[PDB]
Amino acid sequence: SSFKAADLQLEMTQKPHKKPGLVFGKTFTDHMLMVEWNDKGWGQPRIQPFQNLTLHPASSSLHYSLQLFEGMKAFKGKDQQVRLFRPWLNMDRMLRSAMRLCLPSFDKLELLECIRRLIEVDKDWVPDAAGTSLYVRPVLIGNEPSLGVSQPTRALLFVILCPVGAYFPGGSVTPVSLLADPAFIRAWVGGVGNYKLGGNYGPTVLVQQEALKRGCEQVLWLYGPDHQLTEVGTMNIFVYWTHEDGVLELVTPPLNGVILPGVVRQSLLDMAQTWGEFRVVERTITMKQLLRALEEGRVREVFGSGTACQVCPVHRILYKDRNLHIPTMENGPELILRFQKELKEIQYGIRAHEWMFPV
Amino acid sequence: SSFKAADLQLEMTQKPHKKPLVFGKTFTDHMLMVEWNDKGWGQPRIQPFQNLTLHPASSSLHYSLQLFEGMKAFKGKDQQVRLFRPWLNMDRMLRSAMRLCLPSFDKLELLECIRRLIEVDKDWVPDAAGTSLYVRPVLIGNEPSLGVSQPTRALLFVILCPVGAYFPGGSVTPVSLLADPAFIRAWVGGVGNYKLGGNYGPTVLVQQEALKRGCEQVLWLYGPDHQLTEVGTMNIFVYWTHEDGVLELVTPPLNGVILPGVVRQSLLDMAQTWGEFRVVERTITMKQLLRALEEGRVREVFGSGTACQVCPVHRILYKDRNLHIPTMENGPELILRFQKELKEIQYGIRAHEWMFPV
Ligand SMILES: CNC(=O)c1ccc(-c2ccccc2NS(C)(=O)=O)cc1O[C@@H]1CCN(C(=O)c2ccc(Br)s2)C1
Numbered sequence: 001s002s003f004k005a006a007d008l009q010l011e012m013t014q015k016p017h018k019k020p021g022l023v024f025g026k027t028f029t030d031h032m033l034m035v036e037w038n039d040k041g042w043g044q045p046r047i048q049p050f051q052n053l054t055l056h057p058a059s060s061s062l063h064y065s066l067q068l069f070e071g072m073k074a075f076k077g078k079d080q081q082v083r084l085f086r087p088w089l090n091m092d093r094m095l096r097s098a099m100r101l102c103l104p105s106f107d108k109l110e111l112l113e114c115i116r117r118l119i120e121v122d123k124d125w126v127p128d129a130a131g132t133s134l135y136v137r138p139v140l141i142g143n144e145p146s147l148g149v150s151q152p153t154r155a156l157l158f159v160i161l162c163p164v165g166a167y168f169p170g171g172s173v174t175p176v177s178l179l180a181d182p183a184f185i186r187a188w189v190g191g192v193g194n195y196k197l198g199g200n201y202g203p204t205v206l207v208q209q210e211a212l213k214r215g216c217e218q219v220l221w222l223y224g225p226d227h228q229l230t231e232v233g234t235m236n237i238f239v240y241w242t243h244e245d246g247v248l249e250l251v252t253p254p255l256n257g258v259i260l261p262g263v264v265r266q267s268l269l270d271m272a273q274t275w276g277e278f279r280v281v282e283r284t285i286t287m288k289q290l291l292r293a294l295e296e297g298r299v300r301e302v303f304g305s306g307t308a309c310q311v312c313p314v315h316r317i318l319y320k321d322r323n324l325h326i327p328t329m330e331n332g333p334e335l336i337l338r339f340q341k342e343l344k345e346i347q348y349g350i351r352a353h354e355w356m357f358p359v
Numbered sequence: 360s361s362f363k364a365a366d367l368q369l370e371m372t373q374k375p376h377k378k379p380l381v382f383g384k385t386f387t388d389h390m391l392m393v394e395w396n397d398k399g400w401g402q403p404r405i406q407p408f409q410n411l412t413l414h415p416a417s418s419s420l421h422y423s424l425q426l427f428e429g430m431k432a433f434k435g436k437d438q439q440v441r442l443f444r445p446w447l448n449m450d451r452m453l454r455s456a457m458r459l460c461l462p463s464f465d466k467l468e469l470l471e472c473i474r475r476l477i478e479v480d481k482d483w484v485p486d487a488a489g490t491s492l493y494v495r496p497v498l499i500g501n502e503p504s505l506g507v508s509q510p511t512r513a514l515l516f517v518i519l520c521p522v523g524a525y526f527p528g529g530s531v532t533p534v535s536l537l538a539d540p541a542f543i544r545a546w547v548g549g550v551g552n553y554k555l556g557g558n559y560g561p562t563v564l565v566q567q568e569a570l571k572r573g574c575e576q577v578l579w580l581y582g583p584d585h586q587l588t589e590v591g592t593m594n595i596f597v598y599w600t601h602e603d604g605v606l607e608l609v610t611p612p613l614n615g616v617i618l619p620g621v622v623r624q625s626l627l628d629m630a631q632t633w634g635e636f637r638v639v640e641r642t643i644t645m646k647q648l649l650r651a652l653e654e655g656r657v658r659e660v661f662g663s664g665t666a667c668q669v670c671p672v673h674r675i676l677y678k679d680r681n682l683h684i685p686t687m688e689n690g691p692e693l694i695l696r697f698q699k700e701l702k703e704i705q706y707g708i709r710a711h712e713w714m715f716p717v
């Protein structure tokens with residue numbers, strides 16, 4: 001049985017830190033959530049001051065990557081009300097990751113209430129300047145003090161919080177360049193690339209360095225012999241184009257196992273479907289199709305989606321030592337700006353919406 | 360700007376543990392620890408076995424910036440302790456470090472620090488038949504940042520475990536394997552050929568499935584031709600008469616999906632040195648194995664790795680098809696020979712350049 005928010009233990013900090021007057025992910029708030037699991041089940045969850053973890057040096061979290069995480073944002077409106085964006089989807093994803101790594105199950109609504117309580121305690125850390133937010137990082141790790149590759153009998157679930165600045169200076173989207181080299185493979189069918197596991201990230205650090213060495217800003221992850229476009233950096237990928245059949249559409253790759261099911265990705269699909277102005281589809285996208293569409297002037301916008309900046313335009317792709325210009329900005333970018341605006345209105349509470357979870 | 364064994368700081372334990380045996384749950388009294396940051400490597404230290412203190416944003420825990428090694432030290436009858444081909448583990452550890460953008464170090468300095476550590480804990484090294492000391496070096500990223508990036512801080516540590524005999528009784532005991540193409544350990548373009556923690560966590564659930572289906576370990580298949588890549592966390596070997604009528608030992612080649620085992624390389628080296636049969640690195644498919652079994656051409660199938668040296672296989676469940684592998688009905692002659700020769704080398708019965716004295 002899960003830990004219960006009703007059993008939450010609180011210890012306030014005696015070392016409150018001054019708030020920022022901000023690189024992503026290096027500044028943390030005063031408190032954290034911690035819950036321990038062992039052979040007698042889950043202990044009581046606690047909100048405690050931000051502090052170090054103490055781990056046995058054989059901890060399976062460090063030897064065999066028994067580790068998963070989530071990432072979601074909370075936003076503060078004019079009324080100083082803080083709200084989480086579709087957090088139930090992050091909890092669903094987190095539980096699926098836990099099962100994949102044989103880590104203990106928990107109740108999604110109990111964890112979400114514990115997170116709400118934590119954010120409520122640190123509510124003053126949530127910035128309210130334009131484009132700013134609080135990044136919420138839940139983690140679940142195995143913690144067996146054994147070198148056996150096995151299901152752990154101990155685990156730790158914790159949550160830390162970061163205030164974050166605006167991703168774009170002045171809120172105005174700026175496009176990125178991408179390296180598209182089939183040598184680099186993020187994930188495989190039947191693998192674990194569709195789960196938010198730590199193991200999926202470490203190996204990309206060197207690849208991103210190669211991208212920079214080749215004059216590109218992010219990696220376009222290609223898959224298969226037909227060079228399917230799967231993801232971009234740590235974001236999902238979308239293409240807005242007139243398709244080979246003459247119909248204007250928004251396409252993103254389907255959830256076939258090599259795609260992480262992004263919350264923003266799902267939200268873009270939901271939003272575009274609701275408008276009912278153009279075709280919205282989940283279909284494989286190949287470099288062959290993109291090359292043709294570009295030569296025929298059919299591509300309007302290409303962009304990544306994710307919690308980091310909601311949506312980010314792409315203007316260049318380096319493929320087979322050839323630079324492809326992507327005319328996203330020439331096309332407004334109308335759709336990107338529309339999605340950005342609707343998300344901003346929902347996230348900051350300008351428009352009421354069931355997607356927002358009040359703290 | 361590597362750490363140097365000459366700078367080692369020794370802190371002896373004031374609370375030694377009583378000596379003993381399940382693998383990997385019992386640890387010796389001391390550990391090696393070295394930290395890295397913007398100023399480079401700090402001084403290495405041998406200190407009492409103790410917990411790690413990690414910032415909650417440590418990149419080791421979020422983005423799996425972590426790698427490890429595994430090697431054995433063996434105590435001969437005159438109480439001399441020796442490591443088996445440790446230079447190869449150091450080589451592999453450095454390749455792992457580079458792949459995860461973790462700091463380089465001098466392989467001989469680490470090896471000397473490890474030697475010094477084992478020396479301190481020498482009385483933990485057992486000397487009964489088939490026993491050894493398992494050495495577990497680890498290198499982890501340790502940047503207090505949620506940015507997916509090259510860390511500016513890292514930790515290198517080494518812990519030690521006394522280990523009992525893998526085959527209690529002394530005689531090899533074979534295992535059953537589940538071979539289901541649904542399961543994928545590694546892919547070409549991935550990192551399965553590096554000893555990185557990320558390659559291990561996802562296998563836990565798969566191993567549970569093997570147990571549920573009545574098998575002991577997983578036979579990792581790859582590709583449309585159902586290539587046999589590895590078994591459990593060991594390399595795989597087949598000793599058979601191939602389709603061209605030639606007696607041969609085959610193991611899959613290092614083409615990206617195979618971890619380059621130290622035992623694996625040693626078996627190839629040993630068999631090539633004997634010069635009695637063909638020794639090759641070539642992919643092995645289930646189609647070939649099926650045909651070879653029907654034709655009575657398979658002699659032995661086994662895994663190789665530090666845990667057992669070599670382990671016979673007697674059964675493979677290939678989806679719903681239960682296949683007897685006649686390893687034990689064939690001696691298993693090759694397995695016994697490898698085990699004998701390795702034992703002679705590892706326990707100092709026969710002096711050899713492969714052994715590093717402590
Ligand atoms: C400044 N960086 C961020 O705000 C950021 C925060 C969290 C994660 C983060 C941390 C862990 C896991 C995933 C992450 N990304 S996400 C899902 O939050 O977008 C990633 C972040 O940004 C990096 C840099 C830009 N980026 C990209 O993927 C791309 C930019 C433009 C294109 Br097109 S792709 C990732």
Ligand SMILES: CNC(=O)c1ccc(-c2ccccc2NS(C)(=O)=O)cc1O[C@@H]1CCN(C(=O)c2ccc(Br)s2)C1
Pocket residue numbers: 147149382429525534576590591592593661662663664665666667670671672
């Ligand atoms: C009793 N277990 C061990 O001694 C052991 C030690 C280290 C590692 C260990 C830890 C981390 C990384 C790799 C490991 N294996 S290794 C390279 O030491 O052999 C694995 C160990 O054993 C498990 C159980 C058996 N096994 C197998 O792979 C197979 C048995 C028979 C066949 Br055929 S396969 C793995």
Ligand SMILES: *Cc1c(COP(=O)(O)O)cnc(C)c1O
Pocket residue numbers: 071196231233234235236260261262263264265305306307308
């Ligand atoms: C987290 C993640 C996504 C989806 O991100 P959301 O923030 O949930 O939209 C996509 N791809 C990768 C690689 C990720 O890590």
Ligand SMILES: *Cc1c(COP(=O)(O)O)cnc(C)c1O
Pocket residue numbers: 429554589591592593594618619620621622623663664665666
């Ligand atoms: C370590 C390892 C090997 C090879 O092991 P050695 O002990 O070096 O012979 C093979 N496969 C996997 C999956 C491993 O982790």
Ligand SMILES: [Cl-]
Pocket residue numbers: 131133167307308309310
């Ligand atoms: Cl944002």
Ligand SMILES: [Cl-]
Pocket residue numbers: 489491525665666667668
């Ligand atoms: Cl052994």
